[PDB]
């Protein structure tokens, strides 16, 4: 009458019997995203229905086995995931209504149009209205064209989200939680290990300390952007103050890349554009990732299996099939590794291929781990690991080595300054907005503010740390944060904040072992077999051991810091300080634009 062998045998049977139901369920989805038609969706749903029921019925029997008697740590780590249930905790009504609410939010975000101009011009949200937002140069046009989304979709989605908050507040507390914020933060908690313990309350302090050391760079960049935008758009945007909500390229202000044309460091000079060197010298789609596989081999990593070059789709359909292609890299299960991507000859496809191959190699690295541990250490490792090598492959040294750049080329100061600013506009432009959104979400899930003051506090305390002002007031009739797709579909936003920090620490730690002397923004990791082994040590670890042990293995520092991130942008800060000598850095929140 053993008390732990029972758990061991149950886990063994689950592991050995859950692979057949999952491989053929994933293959149905793969066949769906290669020829969309009536039969393929039917097959995908039919295969997913066979696994949803199995997963819902295995948890009910895994819950019986206690988590206190069990002693072996790698058994509790696997059993904890299966013990935790999902939406199958609320009663019949609270789930048959929650599912309906979620579907209604998805539908109402999907459907939307505005009619600002003559009746015939009822431009929908995408792609015409998005294009005119990201390309126009005006004030009245943008204002009267995108007052629609924050005043119609927001009004549509107020009551449903108001009900959703109180309906899902009493869903986490069923699973022994304080509020939904605890459920969201539980993805990082690791307990039961000595000297490796990270509570939910510690992550808040970690984020609040991490955000404090990036303020000088953001303030300097904000001052530079404001100074340029005063010159570009006249009679508006007061010389000292905050930026308007619109006018910043993308609507929600997540990215700042579309303002690159507005703000360029040094004009009359060309950036590195390796697209004609790939055109005059003929180069097809196969070699585009064949050379990437060559690079992965050069960093001393295993080759790609033959079960990848026969079946994976790597170009335009070209045979009458209708498929919507976005760059992904599937992991079908038992030994299968496939990549689907529409390839065209530019840098964007090249770097995207590098990213997808990097993270599919990460997926292949931990293939030996059981089914319940075939994932990254945390939810932010895959994207950061993939992006590290895309960043490392963008250097001019590696490009010259591959033969794409002229041998008789010397990297000028202006070109490297432009490259640094182009990366900064997209990297540091998302950090304070992501932190803003996640802080507001957490603070509203905890119920700190009343439900009668939802948008007033949102705008007032966004104008403080993001420093973006909003034209005209919104007196609790306009659900503003609902415009984002991630908020409407209930997706996590912390991953994007921590991914940048993780990748910037990983880059420095990896290139210190590669023995590169000089600047960090032109550092390259190739022909570095020992560095490849150091990285593979972390990659092969999997999720068996707590992510901070992986952090210590790859780097050696338990906590996460921004000093590696600040090392990359030191020349940018040094130059920008010299550029700003007659301007006043700061976003004193006193002026408003809605003064009639």
């Amino acid at each position: 009458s053993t008390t732990e062998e029972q758990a061991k045998t149950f886990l063994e049977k689950f592991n050995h019997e859950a692979e057949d139901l999952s491989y053929q369920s994933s293959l149905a989805s793969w066949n769906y995203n290669t020829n969309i038609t009536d039969e393929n969706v039917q097959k995908m749903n039919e295969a997913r229905a066979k696994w949803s029921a199995f997963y819902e019925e295995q948890s009910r029997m895994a819950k019986t086995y206690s988590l206190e008697e069990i002693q072996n740590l790698t058994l509790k780590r696997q059993l904890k995931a299966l013990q935790h249930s999902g939406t199958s905790a609320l009663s019949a009504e609270k789930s048959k209504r929650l599912n309906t609410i979620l579907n209604k939010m998805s539908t109402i975000y999907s459907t939307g149009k505005v009619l600002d101009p003559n009746t015939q011009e009822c431009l929908a949200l995408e792609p015409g209205l998005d294009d005119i937002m990201e390309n126009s140069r005006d004030y009245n046009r943008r204002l009267w064209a995108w007052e629609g989304w924050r005043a119609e979709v927001g009004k549509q989605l107020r009551p449903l989200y108001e009900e959703y908050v109180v309906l899902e507040n009493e869903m986490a507390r069923a699973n022994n939680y304080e509020d939904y914020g605890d459920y969201w933060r539980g993805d990082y908690e690791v307990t039961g290990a000595g000297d490796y313990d990270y509570s939910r309350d510690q992550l808040m302090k970690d984020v609040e300390r991490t955000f404090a050391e990036i303020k000088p760079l953001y303030e300097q960049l904000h001052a530079y952007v404001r100074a340029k935008l005063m010159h570009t758009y006249p009679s508006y945007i007061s010389p000292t103050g905050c930026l308007p909500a619109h006018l910043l390229g993308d609507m929600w202000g997540r990215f700042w890349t579309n303002l690159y044309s507005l703000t360029v460091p040094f004009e009359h000079k060309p950036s590195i554009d390796v697209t004609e060197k790939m055109e005059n010298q003929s180069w097809d789609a196969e070699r585009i990732f064949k050379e990437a596989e060559k690079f992965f081999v050069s960093i001393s990593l295993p080759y790609m299996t033959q079960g990848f070059w026969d079946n994976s789709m790597l170009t335009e359909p070209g045979d009458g099939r209708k498929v919507v292609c976005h760059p992904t890299a599937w992991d079908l299960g038992k030994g299968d590794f496939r990549i689907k991507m529409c390839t065209k000859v530019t840098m964007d496809d090249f770097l995207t291929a590098h990213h997808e191959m990097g993270h599919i190699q990460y997926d292949m690295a931990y293939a030996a781990q059981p089914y319940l541990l075939r994932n990254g250490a945390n939810e932010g490792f895959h994207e950061a690991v993939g992006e590290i090598m895309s960043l490392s492959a963008a250097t001019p040294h590696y490009l010259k080595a591959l033969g794409l750049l002229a041998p008789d080329f010397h990297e000028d100061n202006e070109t490297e300054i432009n490259f640094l600013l182009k990366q900064a506009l997209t990297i540091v432009g998302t950090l304070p907005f992501t932190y803003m959104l996640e802080k507001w979400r957490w603070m509203v899930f905890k119920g700190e503010i009343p439900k009668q003051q939802w948008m007033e506090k949102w705008w007032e305390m966004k104008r403080e740390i993001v420093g973006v002002v909003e034209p005209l007031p919104h007196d609790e009739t306009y659900c503003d944060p609902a415009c984002l797709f991630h908020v409407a579909e209930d997706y996590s936003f912390i991953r994007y904040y921590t991914r940048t920090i993780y990748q910037f620490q990983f880059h420095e730690a990896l290139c210190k072992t590669a023995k590169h002397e000089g600047a960090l923004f032109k550092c390259d990791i190739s022909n570095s077999t020992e560095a490849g082994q150091r990285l593979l040590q972390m990659l092969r670890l999997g999720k068996s051991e707590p992510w901070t042990l992986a952090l210590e293995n790859i780097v050696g520092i338990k906590t996460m810091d921004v000093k590696p991130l600040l090392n990359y942008f030191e020349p940018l800060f040094t130059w920008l300080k010299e550029q700003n000598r007659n301007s006043f850095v700061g976003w004193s929140t006193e002026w408003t634009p809605y003064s009639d």
Binding site: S1, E17, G307, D336
Partner: protein
């Protein structure tokens, strides 16, 4: 010399599960092991006991053969004196067995589209399989205080599981036909001796 089983035991159409191997006793025959090279490009030919150089001129009393169909990761598990999940519950080899092991890949025949469910491998077993031991009859494994009462449910599972075989699996999960050849010594006038 006359249609010895050394070829007719490899070209068989349907093989057996790993727990019901078809042992064959090799009668009087000549031990020409260099003609097996004319049957397929084998994947594994390494073999223990006697170095292959000396195998040209040797003689023994009787030779026994066993046939399986197994995955790829478990090919290295059939080596003597190893521990695992198939080498200790379905087929265990003696530590000092003086025979040879041959295995070759068969994925264009053993794997069908939409899955082929005709092979099995045991997973649950109370004791440990002694070297050269077999058992085919299954019983509902007792993994609980409550008696199984001949049925499944809580703590009572089914040992045998079907080998999932698909034509798109990686090299790791490709079916591999396996034949194990072992030599025996007695105190009788020997029958099989090499040329």
């Amino acid at each position: 010399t006359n249609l010895c089983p050394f070829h007719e035991v490899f070209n068989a159409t349907r093989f057996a599960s790993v727990y019901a191997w078809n042992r064959t006793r090799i009668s009087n025959c000549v031990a020409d092991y260099s003609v097996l090279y004319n049957f397929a490009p084998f994947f594994a030919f390494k073999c223990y006991g006697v170095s292959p150089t000396k195998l040209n001129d040797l003689c023994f009393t009787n030779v026994y053969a066993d046939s399986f169909v197994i995955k790829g990761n478990e090919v290295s598990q059939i080596a003597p004196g190893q521990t695992g999940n198939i080498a200790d519950y379905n087929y265990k080899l003696p530590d000092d067995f003086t025979g040879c092991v041959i295995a070759w890949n068969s994925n264009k025949l053993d794997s069908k589209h939409s899955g082929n469910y005709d092979y099995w491998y045991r997973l649950f077993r109370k004791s440990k399989l002694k070297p050269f031991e077999r058992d085919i009859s299954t019983e509902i494994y007792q993994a609980g205080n409550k008696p199984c009462k001949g049925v499944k449910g809580p703590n009572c599972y089914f040992p045998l599981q079907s080998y999932g075989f698909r034509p798109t699996y990686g090299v790791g999960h490709q079916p591999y036909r396996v034949v194990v050849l072992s030599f025996e010594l007695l105190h009788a006038p020997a029958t099989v001796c090499g040329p």
